[PDB]
Amino acid sequence: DVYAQEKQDFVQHFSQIVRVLTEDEMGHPEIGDAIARLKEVLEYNAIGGKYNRGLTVVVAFRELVEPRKQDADSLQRAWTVGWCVELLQAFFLVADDIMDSSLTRRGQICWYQKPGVGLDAINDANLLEACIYRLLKLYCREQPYYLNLIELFLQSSYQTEIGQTLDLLTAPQGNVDLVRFTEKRYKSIVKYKTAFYSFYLPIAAAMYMAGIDGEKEHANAKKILLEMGEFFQIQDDYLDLFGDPSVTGKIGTDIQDNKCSWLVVQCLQRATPEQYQILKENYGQKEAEKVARVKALYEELDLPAVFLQYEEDSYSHIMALIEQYAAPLPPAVFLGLARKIYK
Amino acid sequence: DVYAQEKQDFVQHFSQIVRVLTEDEMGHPEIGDAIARLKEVLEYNAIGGKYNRGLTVVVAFRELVEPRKQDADSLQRAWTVGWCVELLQAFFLVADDIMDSSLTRRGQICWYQKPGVGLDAINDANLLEACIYRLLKLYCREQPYYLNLIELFLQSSYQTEIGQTLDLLTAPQGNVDLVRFTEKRYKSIVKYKTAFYSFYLPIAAAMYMAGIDGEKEHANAKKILLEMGEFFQIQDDYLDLFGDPSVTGKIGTDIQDNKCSWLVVQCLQRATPEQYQILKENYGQKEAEKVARVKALYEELDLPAVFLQYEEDSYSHIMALIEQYAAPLPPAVFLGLARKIYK
């Protein structure tokens, strides 16, 4: 609802964003050919998703700021900082698809997979990260929260990177070692690699634009938000194997890709030498036969039930956190998000 | 000399830099395994070079700042911002070696080429870029020039990226098209891809730490510095084919790698349909026979002489620029650099 009647103005602001990131640079015809390429990279990797992160910035902005302080200017910046979050993600995904050796993303071909692009996508991903800061300068240069956003995005980039390193160390491409797929490692990965930039960064940004820069306040928001992030990912791994493609719009391949899914992490705890022997035998196989075997071992261990139980507790805990750390923020800011992820 | 008696204190400060970038992070054992990896990336890609860029920061610092304002603290930061420049480069080189499909660098194996690293080097390069800003916060958080350096490094990163895009567009891996190897394109590449972060960034940084943030002043420094950068690269391409490995310490392969060298750009201007037919036939070949043929066509066109002539003019022009835009800066700052590149 609140997101539905915002997407319009949001996705429409992308044309300005692109225009700015190119027309101004055209003051130097020498790099005109590069700027042309830059436009292709943006119109292909930025556009496409549901913009839930980018919009969270816009949505949270309206709530945190007084109705009469949301003039044209303030909204223009908000939509910009909103797209910056979206660009940061584009940067992460473009680069991750190369490392993981992915074929598709959002059903379409991965940028580096297109003919003529290849590994040059590495530079393209870096350009995307660069645009973030060019925008912060073109729109918030004079704002009192300018240095806060620059440091926010930088910090988020770092956290996601450290997280990405952990994941790589945990599941080496060519090392089906389910031994290091602990629950403790799973949470550390989700926190740094997903939770931080997916839930905290969007809100944190909005807060700074609203003048809420108090460390303690951000310390409470981050507390709530990282819990939602942790649930979001666990629901994502679950749905990937027990979900319905016609609804989720995605085809699960976690077992095949030999990922450190939440399921397999649980499957390893509640398991006996006989259970493990089987799992350690059909995990990471491209056989429609061996995959169905792992799924069976999950159902057999009541993992689906373990999920529901976790979801139930989770929702309670989040609400408990919200009833205590929401203030001075409007509970609606966190309630709206919870009602977005707890499908 | 001035560089010789600085390298000692510089390279010695690297242990602190690493220590800081890891011990402080150890406050979170969860990411300890990543931080361990981060240390390997740093001790392998940061160390090794001659640190001419990093040192320029330290050297220029001493000159621009009053002898009594160079206490322990000021030097500690200077060496840090010095290493940040060095880290920015490490980030560019690690990533460029992957894109170009290089085998070696500084005579040693390219980071992504080591067993177990591979494309994960993409994330490693990003971490290196991240450390830059973690250092600026750990050392200059409270400095009055903090936002200036953050924006300097960001800007330099952007410029180098745009430049990198141009180079990729100019010499597509699988397109021996000497048609777009113009002199105009060559200069645009060198400017953005090399000149900016190699000569301007090191000095610009030192200037900001010295309080010299005046736009006009930086506008003059950049003017001089980008000219030296342009000569530096042209001397680098020259030396690559007509230099002496026992002295330069490098084995030239520009003709083979089918690069947009300064030589070949000149070779194309002063050429007749017969000259071009030959060049367009032996450029980019791994044959010790075809390579020697291109070299001959260069000598035959008096290119070596064209270089010397260019060097002569260059030195004059730079000195002319220095005698006019050096102030308020001490000419010694630019004279020291010129005497470093004009071998």
Ligand SMILES: COc1ccc2c(CC(=O)O)coc2c1
């Ligand atoms: C921060 O709010 C969010 C973040 C992510 C999501 C998603 C998944 C996605 O589209 O990536 C659905 O609702 C969200 C809401």
Ligand SMILES: COc1ccc2c(CC(=O)O)coc2c1
């Ligand atoms: C895991 O099982 C459940 C069952 C009910 C719920 C609810 C109630 C609601 O907010 O609509 C939230 O998460 C749930 C999870």
Ligand SMILES: COc1ccc2c(CC(=O)O)coc2c1
């Ligand atoms: C900014 O001053 C410089 C920059 C680069 C260099 C080099 C080449 C290198 O070591 O990369 C020699 O002297 C320099 C001096």
Ligand SMILES: COc1ccc2c(CC(=O)O)coc2c1
């Ligand atoms: C290209 O031929 C030359 C010859 C002499 C020189 C000098 C004189 C000096 O500063 O030592 C600088 O660059 C030169 C280039």
